[PDB]
Design a protein around this ligand. Structure first.
Ligand code: NAD
Ligand code: NAD
Ligand code: TYR
Lengths: 293, 290
């Protein structure tokens, strides 16, 4: 009698649309299936090969490249997984196709104003999210059915978020193994501006530095074993994605670089003043914090 | 020809002194012993714990915390492996205590004027070296008997360098796995200023940024490897080692940081001014084959 928590659960989400059928879109589709989801998974992509590869791999049941065909799929759950620069335009087009009862959510690596813009486009259907997962992979062929297990997923509810959709999006992420927490859109963009965007910005600029400080007689790239090695991981990054993340989170990325410049300026001062003991303590305190994890 | 070359090497290294018995001094001691070396290995260190640990692990035959006692060791081959600013005053002491025929070399991460200062203190005894190998760990407990295997070692001979000792030091490094090349002391300090000292300075400051940008309600350290973790492994390195390197190589470290800043400033402006094409071109630089 009371056990019918089960039926509500099955009826809460029946036709799922993956927008952007790439690595993240496909890892989500796969992880969703692996958690025992029995409904339909549909794909929408501008690249018909993304759809082609995902269907034959069994990752979606069917898909399309015409936005207007999406309507035939009557999705009630949408996971935005294209580049974040596409989200506004696509959400414009979903806003008419989707029933008032649909839920839209996303995996976008930036939140901030984008969440407010998406909720204004989509009314009440929208819940912002960011799974702190990722690797340096692209394309559905690389999608993993456990990408999210044991990782943080940040949802960014507002005063406008629908509590039952927030709660569903939370539960769907936990079914795939994620650990959910909440941050405002603005706090999210500050936090990840600092812990994620800044570190990439600074790896980018390091590479640029070794290029202009090399001379015709000296290729500095020949000497990676002195500390530069870990920074060369930046070679695996996608320049277009970073370009878009930098632009979209510009105000937080600039604040983060600013606080970085303050830290580096402090280190220069200790160096030039030969502050022997201060310099040790500066390095010791960063040592301890970095070791905690 | 091999027999003899080997005899000569043996005889010229009966008594090795490791000065600073920590991660690099221990790695050197273990590497030498793994390579089949048969003489004595002694340790001298300011920390008595460094000595007893190294003895207990069978890394050195014997050691001491008194520089005077080094004379009883009659070292003929000394590998300086303490923090780089300890070298001058240690050398001064050694010059009285070591025989004229001994070789003194080093593992320090800075060369530059220190090579010259050390040649003036030690005379013909001295050969400047720097193995480009290490991790963030420090202390003899972390040392490894294959640390230098297949790694570059830079020697910095000058006008004044004794050729026999240069050949000796080179073959010792190649014996433990290293691949030797030469640079001038000054070229060394500019190369490694940019490629090793600046990336460390950058990693340290990155972690420091998360400290001050944190609030009591938001601990930025709860969110690591949004990529931070990968780029700051080297910010767990030793504060004394790194304080010494930054001060000893101060002018190059400043020149490297100034270079970096101009790159960072270029990047900022591309971001601020939303230059889609130029920004993506700048970022594409990580794809270069070098
Ligand atoms: N890669 C990561 O480490 C990572 C981590 C966390 C979050 N994210 C987020 O995941 C999203 C996509 O990332 P990905 O790594 O899967 O990229 P991806 O390259 O693997 O795939 C994106 C897919 O979107 C499709 N696409 C591109 N433009 C489109 C448009 N106009 N309409 C519909 N589809 C379009 C592509 O054709 C491709 O099939 C981004 O929003 C990114 O911020 C990525
Ligand atoms: N750690 C690395 O990656 C690495 C790589 C290449 C070169 N180096 C250079 O190696 C040398 C040793 O570094 P490490 O990583 O072995 O450091 P470490 O902390 O592991 O060891 C340093 C040792 O020297 C001792 N010491 C400190 N002051 C001394 C003094 N006044 N006299 C005698 N001993 C003293 C300490 O007690 C300790 O046992 C430094 O010059 C460093 O720049 C380090
Ligand atoms: N410890 C650095 C590598 C390194 C190599 C040579 C040095 O002189 C200093 C540091 C990593 O880990």
């Amino acid at each position: 009698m009371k056990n019918i928590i089960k039926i509500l659960k099955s009826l809460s989400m029946q036709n799922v649309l993956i927008v952007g059928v790439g690595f993240m879109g496909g890892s989500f589709a796969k992880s969703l299936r692996r958690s025992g989801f029995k409904g339909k998974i549909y794909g929408y992509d501008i690249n018909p090969e993304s759809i082609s590869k995902a269907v034959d791999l069994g990752i979606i049941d069917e898909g399309t490249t015409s936005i207007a065909k999406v309507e035939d799929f009557s999705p009630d759950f949408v996971m935005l997984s294209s580049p974040v620069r596409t989200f506004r335009e696509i959400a414009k087009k979903l806003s008419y196709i989707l029933s008032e009862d649909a839920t839209v959510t996303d995996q976008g690596s930036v939140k901030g104003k984008l969440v407010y813009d998406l909720e204004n486009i989509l009314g009440k259907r929208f819940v912002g999210g960011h799974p702190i997962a990722g690797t340096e992979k692209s394309g559905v062929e690389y999608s993993l059915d456990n990408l999210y297990e044991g990782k943080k997923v940040i949802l960014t509810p507002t005063k406008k978020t629908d509590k039952k959709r927030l709660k569903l999006v939370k539960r769907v992420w936990e079914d795939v193994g994620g650990v959910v927490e909440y941050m405002s859109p603005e706090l999210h963009d500050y936090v990840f501006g600092v812990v994620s965007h800044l570190p990439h910005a600074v790896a980018f600029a390091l590479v640029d530095t070794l290029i202009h400080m090399s001379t015709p007689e000296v290729d500095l790239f020949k000497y990676p074993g002195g500390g530069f090695k870990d920074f060369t991981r930046i070679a695996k990054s996608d320049p277009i994605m970073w370009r878009d993340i930098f632009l979209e989170n510009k105000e937080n990325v600039m604040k983060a670089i600013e606080g970085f410049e303050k830290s580096l300026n402090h280190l220069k001062e200790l160096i030039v003043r030969e502050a022997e003991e201060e310099l040790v303590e500066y390095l010791k305190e960063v040592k301890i914090k970095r070791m905690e994890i």
